Design a protein around this ligand. Structure first.
Ligand code: NI
Ligand code: NI
Ligand code: NI
Ligand code: NI
Ligand SMILES: [O-]
Ligand SMILES: [O-]
Lengths: 570, 100, 122, 570, 100, 100
C-alpha cells in the first residue's frame, strides 16, 4: 500500500524532499532526511498508534529507556539540519532525536525513545520545531516584557537592569553585588531563562570582579558609564579570569579613542560586540568594522533589521527623543546624522546574509523590540533572497542554507558567545528541552507552544471556559510550567563559576536550576555556526560607504515586509 | 454585573470586531486577526439573538468573502470556533472554512 | 492666570558654574577623519590621541561647560575651548591610564602621553 | 560661564529660590537650599558626568563608601524641608542626602555618596521626590486595592481584614491568632509594607493580648464590636504593656457613653482617633473634639476631604446604603442626619489647615478611597489657600509652610503614631528607601515611580513590546521589585516586639523584612510634625457649630477641585 | 495616558454598555449584566459631563424601563453604584431601584 | 486571533479613543488622557492605513487643537509616542507637541 505525498504530509507532516513555506515569506525549507520507518509513524489519539501493547510499551518502568515526553513527527529547523524526527525528552532534557514508540512491535525505534506508561505526548506533525531563542541584549526594564519575548519564541534572556531606572533604561547592567543579588531573587519569578550582566566599568579589578562573584554571568561595557580604554581593559582581564563573556557598546563620541583604540584595548581578547552596525551605539561611523575581526562575536539588535523605507525616519527621531536632542542645535543634529546611516544599515542586511554578522538580539526596551528578534531575522532573510537571489550554496530550489545561517543567529550563536551552549541554543541530545512549536503559517510570527525544561510554559490557546481549548479568544497565555514551584524546575539562572563555587544560590535561596557559564574565552568568530566569516570591512569616514573585498555593499530599502500586516492587530 | 472570567475575555472579541469593522468600512482589506474577530463576534451576537447553532454554522460562511480580506487570509482560516450563551445555555459553534 | 500644571517660576539671576576655579583657553584640533565629542568631566589630557593641543595645558583640567554637556570637533576642525580645574582630591584614575594618581605628576603624565602617541606633548 | 535660571532648571531641576507649581493647584513650593556644587551636578547618559574616571569613581569596592543607587538632582518635599539634593541608597536604606559623585575630581561630594561600579542611577532632575505614603486606616478587603494605593504614592498599609468578610468590610480588624497568622502569610505576596491590627475588644486581657503575641502590630476599637468603656480600657492596658498603638472608632450611638465617657476610659493614655471628624464614625455629633486633646493622635479619612458641593449628598446616601437604612424610618433618618454634618466637615478643612488634625488616611473600601489619600491632602491644602489665604507663617510668596504641614499628614505623622517612624515615613538618612518620584504636572495625582526598599516596585510606563518604554499605553504596572523573592526584600511586615521575640516570623516562614513596632505609648499630639496644636474644640450639640478660641470655624464647599477632571479618564 | 487601575477597569464598563446598547438597538430585551452596564456607564458619563450626584440619582431611574429588559430583571437590580470623577473629585452615586 | 501581549494592550487605546471621541462629539473639552488616547489611536490606525512614519509625525499635530482640550492640556503633552505595524513592520512614531 502506498500513500501519495500530499496525503502523507497532511497526516504526518512532510517527509524527505517535501518543502514548506515559512509564514508568508518566499523562503522554503526542505526536509533533508527523516528518521521514521514508513508505516510505523508514532501518533496519539483514538485508535492511534501510541496505545498500550501497540506503539506504547506496557512493560518498562520510567528508568528503563522510557521518555517523559515525546514530540511526534517534528520538522526540526536547527543549525544541525532541517529534518524530520520524533524528539524525546526526559528529566527536562532532550535525550533522543530519532524514532519513538515500542520496540515490541515497531522497527527502527531509537533505544532510549520508548513510549511507556510514563510518557506524555505532544503532536508535532505539521509543525516546525526550533530551539528557544537566545536573546543576549535584554534590558530588564518592565516585567511585562517576558511574555512579549515568549510569544515570539524566545526562551533565554541575557542582559541587565533593575527596572525603569535610567542606568538600566540605557544599559544592560545590573550594577554591583547588591543589585545583582536583588535581581537574582527577582528572577525566581520570571518564567524564562536568565543571565545577568554586571557593570564592565572601573580602573581597579576588585569593584568589577565582585560582581562576578556575586552571581553575574558576564559584563556589559557601555559608553554611558565610560567606554574608556581602562574600563575595556579591566573588564576583559576580569572576564579572562572568570570565564564569562563581555559585551561592548563602544565610545560613539570617539571621546577617548577611535575604533582602533578600542581594538587596541581589547588586545585580541574575545568580546561580544553589541549592535555592531552602530545605530544602537558605537564608534561613529565605523564601528561595524568590528565584525571583520577574529576575536569579535558580532550581533545586531533589531530595529535596523531589515532596512525599510521607514527605518531612517523612525531611528533619527527615536535617537532625538531618547537623547533629548534639539533639532535647532547643530551639534545634536550632527551627532544624530553621524550615528543613523542608511549606508551602514543597508550593508548590515548584506553582512547578515554573508555570515559576517553572526547573531541577532533585541535591545529590548532600550532601542529594540522584545518580541521581534525571531520575526526580523526571517524578514531579513526574505529580503535578501528577493534582492540577492538564492545563495550559491543552495541545492534544489530550497532555501535550506540561508535558513540554517539565519536560525543560527538567534539560537546557537548567542549561546556559544555567552558560554551557555552546553545547556541551550539548539535541538541536540543532552541539552535542555527548551523547544518552540510553530504552525508554518505563523512561523517566526507567533509561537504555538513554548516548552521550557520539558513542560509547556506559554501557548496560544483559547477560551478557558470552553468545551475544548480552540474557541476564541485564542491569545498567548502562561501555562502550568510558570505556576507555583514548577517555575523553578523549568527555568535556568545562568551564573559565573565563582558565584556557584562560593554558594551564592544557597545564600540567596535560589530554587531555579543553576546553569554554569563556561568556555567563553577560548572561542572566536570561527566558532559562530554558519556565520564564521572574517574579512576586512572598510567604512569610508566621509561617505560611510561599506566595502568588503573591494566591493561596495549596498541594497535598497523595501516598502513592504512579510510577517507584518497580514498577522498583527496593531 | 457579576462578570465571570469568560465574560471579561469575550468583551475583547467584541471590541476587536468593532475595530475591524471600522477598518473595513474605510476600505481596507482585512487581515487574519481582524477577519477572525468579525466572524467570532458575529457568532456570539447571533447566539444572543437566539439563532440556532445550525443557523450560525451556515451564516458564518457568508460574513466575509475573499475580496474582503488580504491575500492568503481565506486559506489561513480553517475554522472559527466560539462558545456563547444560547437560549438553551452555552453551546459551541464551529464555522468551517468561513471565507472561500 | 492660565495654569500650566507643574510649571516652574524660576528666580531671577544666573548660575555661575565652577565658580572660583582658574579658567584656561586653549586651541584644539581634530587631526583625525572622524568626529570627536568630548564630555564636560573627562580629564582633558586623556582625550583621543588625534586631538592636537598643548597636552600639558589639559592636565588637572576639564571643559568649563555645563555639567553633562560636550564639545564637538568635526574632522579637521580646530577651535578654542575653555577649561576649568578639576576639584576634589585632584586625582584621576583609569580613563586612558595616563594619570592613575595625582594630577600634580605632570612629567609622568606627559611621558606616558608621548610614548602612547597622544598628540601635542611639547 | 553662567547659565540662566530657566535653562538651569530645565537641565538639572530647580535650584535655590525657584518655585514649582503642584499639579494644577495654586500651590507653589520653593527650593530652600541646594546641596550641589554648581558645575559638578551629577547626571547620567551619553557624554554625561557619571562615567568611569569622571563622576563615577573606578577604584572603590561597594563597601568603600559606594552607593547601590543614586537619585540625581531630586527636589525633596518632606517635613524636614523642601530642598534640592542627590539621594544615596545602600542596602535598601537611605544612607546619604547630599551630593553624589566622585571625590577624585568633584568638589563637595558627601563622603559616603560615591558613585562607583556598584551604583545604579535614577535621574530625579525635574522630579519632586517624597517619602512613600503611610496609610494607617486600611481595610484588607480586596487584594486589587494594593496597586490602587501604589499608583497614588502609598507604600505602607496599616489596618486589618481577612478579605470581604463583613467584620473586615466594617472594621480594620484581623481577629484572633489564627486569622492574624493567615494574613501574615498572605502578606508575603503583597507588594507594599503592611502592619496588621487585632480586635481591640474584650473584658479580659488574655483574649486581646494573644493577638499581639500572634503578630499583630496594634489594635482597632470599633463600635461594631462594642466600643464600650471595658473594651477601650482593656485594649489600652494591652497596648501600654505591648508598646503598640490603638486606633479607635468610637460609640456613635452614645449607647454606653458620650464622648466624655470614652475619654474617661482612655484615662490620658495615647490613642489614635480615626476619622476624627466623625462622618466615618464616632460619638454623634461631637467626636471631633477629640482632636483638641494632648493624648490623642487625630486622623481624618478621605471622603470628607475636602468639603465639596457633592460631599453631603454623596455621604448621606453612602451611609444609608452601607447600613441598609430606610428613608421612611425616622430613627434611620435621624441617625444619618446626626452623623453626616456640613458643620463638622467644613470645620475639618480648617482644622487640617490649623495643624489640629495631624494625619490623613483612606478608610480603603469601608468608607474611603485606597488611592486618594495623597490626592485629597493636596486638594484640601489648595482649597484652604484659596479660602483662607497664604498662612501667616509663609515667607516670600511660597506655600512651603502649608506644604510641610500637609505632607506631614500622610508621611511622618502616621509613622510616628504607629511606632514605625524609625523605619519609614520620611526622607531621612537611616530610614528605609521607600521613595516616590512625581512629575510636577502629575504631583499628588499619579506617581511616576515608586521605589520600595531601594528597588522600583511600581511605575507608570508604556508598551512592553516597544523599542523604548515611553510609547502608549502608559499605565501603572508592577516592576521587578514585586517579582519572585524580591518582594520579600523590598517590603516590611511590621510586628509587635512580643511576636518577634517569640519567633513568629520563623514559625510562619515569613521571608519579608521584619519591622519592630516601638515607642507608641510615650508620644502625644506634641509629637505630630507641623500639626501639634492642642486646643478646646467646642461642638454645639444642637447646631453642630464648631468653635475654637471662641470663633466659629466655617467655610464654603467648592464646586470644582484641581487634581480632578484634567487627569482622570473616569 | 498614565492609566491607573480603576481607569483600566472602568473602560470595560463603557465597552459593556456599548455592547448592550447595540443589542437594545436591534430590538432585544436586555438581560441583567447588560442593564447594569448601561446604567453604570450612564452615571460615569454623567459625572464627566459635570452633572451633580443628586441629578444622577434621579436620572438613573429613567434610563431603562421594564419593557426594555427581560422578565425579573427589574427585581434583580436593587441598586447600581458607580464612582466617577466629578468636577469636585471622585464621588459615589447610588441609583436605587433603577428599573421599576 | 493569536493575540500577543501588545495586541491585547493596544485594544484598550482604541477603546479609550472611542470613549474620548464620544465625549468630544457631545461638546466636552477633552482632558489629558482623552487627548492622548485620541492622538495615539489616530497614529495606530494611520499605520494600519499604510501611511508613512513621516506623514504621521505631521498629521498627528493637527488632530486636536487647543480649543478641543481643557486649559493646560496642550502644555502637559510634550509628545505622544506609538508603535504600530506598518506595511514594512513595526515602527515608532513620535508626534512632537501635538497640540499648540
Ligand atoms: Ni547599546
Ligand atoms: Ni542596549
Ligand atoms: Ni471607622
Ligand atoms: Ni474603617
Ligand atoms: O543598546
Ligand atoms: O472606618
Amino acid at each position: 500500500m502506498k500513500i501519495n505525498r500530499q496525503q502523507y504530509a497532511e497526516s504526518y507532516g512532510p517527509t524527505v524532499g517535501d518543502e514548506v513555506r515559512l509564514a508568508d515569506t518566499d523562503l522554503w525549507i526542505e526536509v533533508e532526511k527523516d528518521y521514521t520507518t514508513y508505516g510505523d509513524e508514532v501518533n496519539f489519539g483514538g485508535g492511534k498508534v501510541l496505545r498500550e501493547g501497540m506503539g506504547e510499551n506496557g512493560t518498562y518502568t520510567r528508568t528503563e529507556n522510557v521518555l517523559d515526553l515525546l514530540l511526534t513527527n517534528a520538522l526540526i529547523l536547527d543549525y544541525t539540519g532541517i529534518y524530520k524526527a520524533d524528539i524525546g525528552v526526559k528529566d527536562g532534557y532532550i535525550v533522543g532525536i530519532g524514532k519513538g514508540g515500542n520496540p515490541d512491535i515497531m522497527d527502527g525505534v531509537t533505544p532510549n525513545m520508548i513510549v511507556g506508561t510514563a510518557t506524555e505526548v505532544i503532536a508535532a506533525e505539521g509543525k516546525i520545531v526550533t530551539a528557544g531563542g537566545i536573546d543576549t541584549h535584554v534590558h530588564f526594564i518592565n516585567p511585562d516584557q517576558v511574555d512579549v519575548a515568549l510569544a515570539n519564541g524566545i526562551t533565554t534572556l541575557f542582559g541587565g537592569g533593575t527596572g525603569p531606572a535610567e542606568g538600566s533604561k540605557a544599559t544592560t547592567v545590573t550594577p554591583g553585588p547588591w543589585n545583582i543579588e536583588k535581581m537574582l531573587k527577582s528572577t525566581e519569578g520570571l518564567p524564562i531563562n536568565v543571565g545577568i550582566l554586571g557593570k564592565g566599568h572601573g580602573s581597579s579589578i576588585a569593584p568589577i570582579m565582585e560582581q562576578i562573584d556575586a552571581g553575574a554571568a558576564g559584563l556589559k561595557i557601555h559608553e554611558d558609564w565610560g567606554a574608556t580604554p581602562a574600563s575595556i581593559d579591566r573588564s576583559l582581564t576580569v572576564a579572562d579570569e572568570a570565564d564569562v563573556q563581555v559585551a561592548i557598546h563602544s565610545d560613539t563620541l570617539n571621546e577617548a579613542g577611535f575604533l582602533e583604540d578600542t581594538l587596541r584595548a581589547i588586545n585580541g581578547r574575545v568580546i561580544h560586540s553589541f549592535h555592531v552596525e552602530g545605530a544602537g551605539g558605537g564608534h561613529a561611523p565605523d564601528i561595524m568594522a568590528m565584525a571583520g575581526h577574529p576575536n569579535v562575536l558580532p550581533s545586531s539588535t533589531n530595529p535596523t533589521r531589515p532596512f525599510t523605507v521607514n527605518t531612517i525616519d523612525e531611528h533619527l527621531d527615536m535617537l532625538m527623543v531618547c537623547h533629548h536632542l534639539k533639532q535647532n542645535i547643530p551639534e545634536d543634529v550632527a551627532f544624530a546624522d553621524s550615528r543613523i546611516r542608511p549606508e551602514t544599515i543597508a550593508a548590515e542586511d548584506i553582512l547578515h546574509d554573508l555570515g559576517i554578522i553572526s547573531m541577532m538580539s533585541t535591545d529590548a526596551l532600550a532601542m529594540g523590540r522584545a518580541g521581534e528578534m525571531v520575526l526580523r531575522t526571517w524578514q531579513t532573510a526574505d529580503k535578501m533572497k528577493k534582492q540577492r537571489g538564492p545563495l550559491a550554496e543552495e541545492k534544489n530550489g530550497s532555501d535550506n542554507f540561508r535558513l540554517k545561517r539565519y536560525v543560527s543567529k538567534y539560537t546557537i550563536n548567542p549561546a556559544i558567545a555567552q558560554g551557555i551552549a552546553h545547556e541551550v541554543g539548539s535541538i541536540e541530545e543532552g541539552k535542555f528541552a527548551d523547544l518552540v512549536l510553530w504552525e508554518p503559517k505563523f512561523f517566526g510570527v507567533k509561537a504555538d507552544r513554548v516548552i521550557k525544561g520539558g513542560i509547556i510554559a506559554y501557548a496560544q490557546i483559547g477560551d478557558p471556559s470552553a468545551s475544548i481549548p480552540t474557541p476564541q479568544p485564542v491569545m498567548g497565555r502562561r501555562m502550568y510550567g510558570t505556576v507555583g514551584d514548577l517555575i523553578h524546575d523549568t527555568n535556568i539562572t545562568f551564573m559565573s563559576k565563582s558565584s556557584i563555587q562560593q554558594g551564592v544560590p544557597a545564600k540567596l535561596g535560589l530554587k531555579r536550576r543553576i546553569g554554569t557559564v563556561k568556555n567563553c574565552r577560548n572561542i572566536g568568530k570561527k566558532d559562530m555556526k554558519w556565520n564564521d566569516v572574517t574579512t576586512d570591512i572598510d567604512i569610508n569616514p566621509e561617505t560611510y560607504e561599506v566595502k568588503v573585498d573591494g566591493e561596495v555593499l549596498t541594497c535598497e530599502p523595501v516598502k513592504e515586509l512579510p510577517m507584518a500586516q497580514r498577522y498583527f492587530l496593531f | 454585573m457579576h462578570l465571570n472570567p469568560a465574560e471579561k475575555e469575550k468583551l475583547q472579541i467584541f471590541l476587536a470586531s468593532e475595530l475591524l469593522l471600522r477598518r473595513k468600512a474605510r476600505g481596507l482589506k482585512l487581515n487574519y486577526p481582524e477577519a477572525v474577530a468579525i466572524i467570532t463576534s458575529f457568532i456570539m451576537e447571533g447566539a444572543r439573538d437566539g439563532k440556532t447553532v445550525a443557523m450560525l454554522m451556515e451564516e458564518g460562511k457568508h460574513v466575509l468573502t475573499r475580496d474582503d480580506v488580504m491575500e492568503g487570509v481565506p486559506e489561513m482560516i480553517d475554522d472559527i470556533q466560539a462558545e456563547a450563551t444560547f437560549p438553551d445555555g452555552t453551546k459551541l459553534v464551529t464555522v468551517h472554512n468561513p471565507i472561500s | 492666570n492660565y495654569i500650566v500644571p507643574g510649571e516652574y517660576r524660576v528666580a531671577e539671576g544666573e548660575i555661575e558654574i565652577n565658580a572660583g576655579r582658574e579658567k584656561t583657553t586653549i586651541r584644539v584640533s581634530n587631526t583625525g577623519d572622524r568626529p570627536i565629542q568630548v564630555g564636560s568631566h573627562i580629564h582633558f589630557v586623556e582625550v583621543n590621541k588625534e586631538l592636537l593641543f598643548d597636552r600639558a595645558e589639559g592636565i588637572g583640567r576639564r571643559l568649563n561647560i555645563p555639567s553633562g554637556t560636550a564639545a564637538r570637533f568635526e574632522p579637521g576642525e580646530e577651535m578654542e575651548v575653555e577649561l576649568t580645574e578639576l576639584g576634589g582630591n585632584r586625582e584621576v584614575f583609569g580613563i586612558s591610564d595616563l594619570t592613575n594618581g595625582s594630577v600634580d605628576n605632570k612629567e609622568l603624565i606627559l611621558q606616558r602621553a608621548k610614548e602612547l602617541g597622544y598628540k601635542g606633548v611639547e
